[PDB]
Amino acid sequence: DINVSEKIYKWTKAGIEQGKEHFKVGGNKVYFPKARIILLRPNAKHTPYQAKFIVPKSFNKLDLRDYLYHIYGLRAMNITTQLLHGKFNRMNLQTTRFREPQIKKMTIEMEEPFIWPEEPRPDENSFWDSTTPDNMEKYREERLNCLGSDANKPGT
Amino acid sequence: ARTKFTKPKPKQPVLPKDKIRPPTQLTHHSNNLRITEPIPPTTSNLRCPDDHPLWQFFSNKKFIRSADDLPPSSHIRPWSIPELRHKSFNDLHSLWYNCLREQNVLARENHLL
Amino acid sequence: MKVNHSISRFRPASWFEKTKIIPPQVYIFRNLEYGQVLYSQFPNFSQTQVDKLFVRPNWSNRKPSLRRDIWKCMCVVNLQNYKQSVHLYQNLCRLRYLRDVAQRKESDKLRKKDSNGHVWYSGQYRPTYCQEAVADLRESLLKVFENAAKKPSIYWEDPWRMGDKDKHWNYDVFNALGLEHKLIQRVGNIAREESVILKELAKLES
Amino acid sequence: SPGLRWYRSPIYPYLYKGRPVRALTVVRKKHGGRNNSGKITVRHQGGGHRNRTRLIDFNRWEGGAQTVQRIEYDPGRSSHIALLKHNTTGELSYIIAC
Amino acid sequence: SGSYQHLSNVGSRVMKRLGNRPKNFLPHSEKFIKKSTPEFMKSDLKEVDE
Amino acid sequence: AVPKKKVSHQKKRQKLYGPGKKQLKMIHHLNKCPSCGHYKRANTLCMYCVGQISHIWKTHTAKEEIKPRQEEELSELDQRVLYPGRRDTKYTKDLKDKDNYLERRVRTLKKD
Amino acid sequence: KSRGNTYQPSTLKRKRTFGFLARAKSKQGSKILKRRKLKGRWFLSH
Amino acid sequence: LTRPWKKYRDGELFYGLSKVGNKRVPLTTKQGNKTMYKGTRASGIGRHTKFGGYVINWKKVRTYV
RNA sequence: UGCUGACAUGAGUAACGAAAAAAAGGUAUAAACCUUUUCACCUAAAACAUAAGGUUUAACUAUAAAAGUACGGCCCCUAAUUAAAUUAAAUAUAAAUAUAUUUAAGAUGGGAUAAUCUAUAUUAAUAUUUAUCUUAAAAUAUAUAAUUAUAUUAUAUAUUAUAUAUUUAUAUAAUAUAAACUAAUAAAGAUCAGGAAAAUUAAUGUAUACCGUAAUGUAGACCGACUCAGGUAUGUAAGUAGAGAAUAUGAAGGUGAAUUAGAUAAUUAAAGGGAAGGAACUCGGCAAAGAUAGCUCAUAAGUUAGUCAAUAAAGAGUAAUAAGAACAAAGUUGUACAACUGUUUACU
RNA sequence: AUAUAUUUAUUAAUAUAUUAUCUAUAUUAGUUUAUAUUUUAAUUAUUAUCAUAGUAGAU
């Protein structure tokens, strides 16, 4: 009667009309999921109609969509998956090197737009204020990497 | 190789004026075209809904909960196992999903921090 | 065998009239990787189209990959006649050429620069190219209507992509025409069932 | 070339100038001197063209008279094969030719 | 930071080794920590184990 | 080709510091700049005064910065949406702190 | 003919020859692994 | 200069701190050949087709009820 | 020539690893970083795509988006091959183990459909190499029931007009460029005889998994202890020239570098030129020098008959007459020895 | 062709300044060239770089 992609589109439309899932629900029923997702800020390359998450490394695209539907009530129409590389890191050169974690980030497309709330001022929020920790780090760098007559050299 | 002795090649065989076909396309692009400055997309055209389900990942629509916005440690306690033991299955399930939601909100924030 | 498809050449109005695969319209495609835009007479495209547009590539404006996933439909613009659509398409190509080769310095001056004097980027995504394409589309359409029933329309991917309905898109000629700025229905996977959606749109205005 | 000077070979025009029947041929695995051990056991044996081995009947049990459809060249045997087709049975098989 | 370390448990053995430093090289470990910390942060009293 | 012995303290020092050729000389040829009453080299321009004049020229002969209209008239929210922030690399950060590795010119003493 | 570049990496080959599972599968490799464990080695194989 | 603050030849690398390091460390998805497929415990979902495709088996797909 | 550590001396010496720089401004801070402009070098590349490799080196943490058609992997299947696997008694064996057979693994290879987009699922039955010549045919001059003439010669496309169906459908004839190159085709030459392995309709499905995706890849991002003139797979690879990917240039692109500035003694390297000589050098013409088309003719002695000799040498015409790019092209003969084309001491 | 000026009446025109000499489509797959098509898409003075100082004659 009709092609496969068209049938799929029709099914999706029907599901939307229903207010049921816009996708075939699986049979492997997870009652108590332990997976968390980190809603990320949007990059320049994305639109207001997209949202990107850090998700579990063993999280499926379909699984993510299901999670978004049932936990939150949001319906992701299209989903992409970006498994990042794990660059080598080490505490110091005396320690063994190992990779940082491969981290899975899934973009979604959604039928209504969204823009984040504006990040707070330094005076307003206590935590979101990068001056202090950065200063502390700088001080640590100075003190450990200070050698001889740079002990007398005044602090930055 | 090219040399003192190399006579030049003949010109390519052109097809006569009468035999050549007229091209299928006659009228091309407008000569008047002008490079205008770009038109950057604006938020004014959007109508981001006040109850967009992605707000559920925030708490009171705050980019970050301040120390005052957070629940204090003395006021808050985790559930006791005995307390949980006399709760229904559906209730427990709901509690679990609320917990998970809270973690997600915190996880987003924690990551940012 | 048959080598050429509909996409394999530039198709004039007469060819379209003979065939009638799609209505009189032009398709526009964002590049999710780089932010570059790709115009086409058809809802599909090939390497030939890419070659035609991306003629003078550099580090800033690299010749894009033909991988199908990173290409996504920015805008589907419908017009009153096949000939008109062809003319619009030609105008867009001309504008692109001007921006890349002929009047490149002027275009560069017009763009947004970062510190260290480069055209603003995030990764290799540059958001100026899309903006230029919208501006270029607006220009080409305007020229077409100056040169010059169905009310023409521009089906957008996204309503946000308009600069502003007051500042731009409110010329007298457009108003006279009845240029309806509609958007494509997102009741399904927009990226995956894109071709189906485009077909449905085509069917709608015929 | 000073190397065609002493290349003398036999001409057999009646010989077949086509491929052998593919059902009667099996690939000729090359061991190249080495044995299971993996160590050159027969010295001086190396690598050449990708030859196929043609299953040439030596018992010639069958029985009855068969017509020689053609006489080909087997890369291995110095001899010549022959695509004997059973006059009645209707079947092709090879045999060292006389 | 620009870390991503906090979303995983990578290089676990190395972390354990660092975390569970031998107690007889505890002065060595803390000498540099003391140096790093400003005067208003640092405390005189010994940071006892859990 | 090769030293036969450990060269002594005496012999390395008389080699290095004994000859006047190898020593540093006093810069006797300083004199007053007429524009600002400070030390400068003889038969040389004052680096302060010429620098000041160069600065003046820059301030006057200044090619106007190109601010595109569309970016100048963006809303703040809209601008944030379009062009979000980013973490700079360690290298980038190092490059940014120019005062760490870039030497500004010192002023000379006032002549008497 | 300049020497020195005798190592010519190719992940697949390395994993075949010096990978953990190759060691495990052979008796000799299993013995090696055991020996490394006894020594105290953090990294038993590629 | 690779970096303008370092005019002279310190023993600093073109990138990173040390070239050398422990080579014996488990592979990731990014490493290896074109044929090297690690995977991330994400998709024991359906079944691989004879032709190279894939067919989802929905009774073996995770829902979050 | 004890070991570990510290620090001396040589010594502020040699060196800063093929190189094109300038300016102006970022920025009254810049030989060294960014921007603009000029100049230059690479261009069958120092370019654009990639493979492999790797301290992510990236246009970076707000990060490298794939149902499939010029996407790969995964997956299906195998090659070479591998395997505490396999088969009262599989065979053999100080033990280890080995062998043979099965069985499971093994890509560098095979693998369905598709822009007028495409549907893989479950079930029922039942191809070594190599060539594209000839000839013939169709065609424009001749001349106009000729001979010459030289080109055309299998494929792919739009158009027009029909023709058949009723404005699609398809057939039909009609016009329509040189050179490459490509894919499906056909027919065809030799000896060196040219891989493996994985049904059909019909019915019923198909709410599209995972994984690679940056940049780097003739290199500062792999191998070479170094940001190492070494090593490192593939397709592209402006035009104009030409036989050509040779050689010149080089549109575009991408560079101009972890040393500069002066100076240019003796002296060394790398070049250019050189009067009268003309191998007098010297172990020895080592090195350097030497090319009177590269095309078309024409080409001896000898001889195993193979223009082997031979790209012969000389000579000739096309070009050139004072000369006025690069690049290919470097004489002849006797003797010893080895027939030849090859191989060998990776580093004398 | 844009921007001044301006004969003049927006616009012709007058003047200089700048800017430009492309581009698009045939011709049966691709590429390049050739010609028609498209278009405003120009035909002499004098330079420059490269080609080993490009080569050569002098100096």
Swiss-Prot record, chain A:
Localization recorded for this chain is: Mitochondrion
Any one GO molecular function term = structural constituent of ribosome
Which one GO biological process term can you cite for this protein? mitochondrial translation
Which residues are the signal sequence here?
A: none
Q: What is its main location?
A: mitochondrion
Q: Which domain of life is it from?
A: Eukaryota
Task: Pull one GO CC term from this UniProt entry.
Answer: mitochondrial large ribosomal subunit
Task: Indicate yes or no for the key word Cell cycle.
Answer: no
What does the miscellaneous comment read? Present with 2200 molecules/cell in log phase SD medium.
Q: Which family does it belong to?
A: Belongs to the universal ribosomal protein uL23 family.
> What does this protein's UniProt record list under function?
Component of the mitochondrial ribosome (mitoribosome), a dedicated translation machinery responsible for the synthesis of mitochondrial genome-encoded proteins, including at least some of the essential transmembrane subunits of the mitochondrial respiratory chain. The mitoribosomes are attached to the mitochondrial inner membrane and translation products are cotranslationally integrated into the membrane.
Query: Under what name is this protein listed?
Result: Large ribosomal subunit protein uL23m
Native organism taxonomy: Eukaryota, Fungi, Dikarya, Ascomycota, Saccharomycotina
> Gene that codes for this?
MRP20
From Swiss-Prot, chain E:
Point out residues bearing the modification N-acetylserine: 1
Compartment(s): Mitochondrion
The source's superkingdom equals Eukaryota
Q: Describe its function.
A: Component of the mitochondrial ribosome (mitoribosome), a dedicated translation machinery responsible for the synthesis of mitochondrial genome-encoded proteins, including at least some of the essential transmembrane subunits of the mitochondrial respiratory chain. The mitoribosomes are attached to the mitochondrial inner membrane and translation products are cotranslationally integrated into the membrane.
Q: What family is it from? A: Belongs to the universal ribosomal protein uL24 family.
Record text on subunit structure and interactions: Component of the mitochondrial large ribosomal subunit (mt-LSU). Mature yeast 74S mitochondrial ribosomes consist of a small (37S) and a large (54S) subunit. The 37S small subunit contains a 15S ribosomal RNA (15S mt-rRNA) and 34 different proteins. The 54S large subunit contains a 21S rRNA (21S mt-rRNA) and 46 different proteins. uL24m forms the wall of the exit tunnel.
UniProt-recorded name of the protein: Large ribosomal subunit protein uL24m
| Gene field | MRPL40
Section of the entire sequence shown: 2 to 51 of 297
Curated annotation (Swiss-Prot), chain F:
Record GO biological process: mitochondrial translation
Q: Which GO terms describe its cellular component?
A: mitochondrial inner membrane; mitochondrial large ribosomal subunit; mitochondrion
Would the keyword DNA repair be found if you checked this record's keyword annotation? no
Give the Gene Ontology MF terms in alphabetical order.
structural constituent of ribosome; zinc ion binding
Primary localisation category: mitochondrion
Report which superkingdom the organism of origin falls in.
Answer: Eukaryota
The free-text function statement in the UniProt record for this protein reads: Component of the mitochondrial ribosome (mitoribosome), a dedicated translation machinery responsible for the synthesis of mitochondrial genome-encoded proteins, including at least some of the essential transmembrane subunits of the mitochondrial respiratory chain. The mitoribosomes are attached to the mitochondrial inner membrane and translation products are cotranslationally integrated into the membrane.
The entry assigns this protein to a family as follows:
Belongs to the bacterial ribosomal protein bL32 family.
Q: How does it assemble?
A: Component of the mitochondrial large ribosomal subunit (mt-LSU). Mature yeast 74S mitochondrial ribosomes consist of a small (37S) and a large (54S) subunit. The 37S small subunit contains a 15S ribosomal RNA (15S mt-rRNA) and 34 different proteins. The 54S large subunit contains a 21S rRNA (21S mt-rRNA) and 46 different proteins. bL32m has a zinc binding site.
Miscellaneous comment as given in the Swiss-Prot or TrEMBL entry: Present with 1700 molecules/cell in log phase SD medium.
* Record-given protein name: Large ribosomal subunit protein bL32m
Organism of derivation: Saccharomyces cerevisiae (strain ATCC 204508 / S288c)
Curated annotation (Swiss-Prot), chain H:
Q: What else is known?
A: Present with 2250 molecules/cell in log phase SD medium.
What organism does this protein naturally occur in? Saccharomyces cerevisiae (strain ATCC 204508 / S288c)
The places in or outside the cell where this protein is found are: Mitochondrion
Name of this protein: Large ribosomal subunit protein mL41
| UniProt superkingdom | Eukaryota
- Assembly with partners or alone: Component of the mitochondrial large ribosomal subunit (mt-LSU). Mature yeast 74S mitochondrial ribosomes consist of a small (37S) and a large (54S) subunit. The 37S small subunit contains a 15S ribosomal RNA (15S mt-rRNA) and 34 different proteins. The 54S large subunit contains a 21S rRNA (21S mt-rRNA) and 46 different proteins.
**Function of the protein:** Component of the mitochondrial ribosome (mitoribosome), a dedicated translation machinery responsible for the synthesis of mitochondrial genome-encoded proteins, including at least some of the essential transmembrane subunits of the mitochondrial respiratory chain. The mitoribosomes are attached to the mitochondrial inner membrane and translation products are cotranslationally integrated into the membrane.
The family line of this record is: Belongs to the mitochondrion-specific ribosomal protein mL41 family.
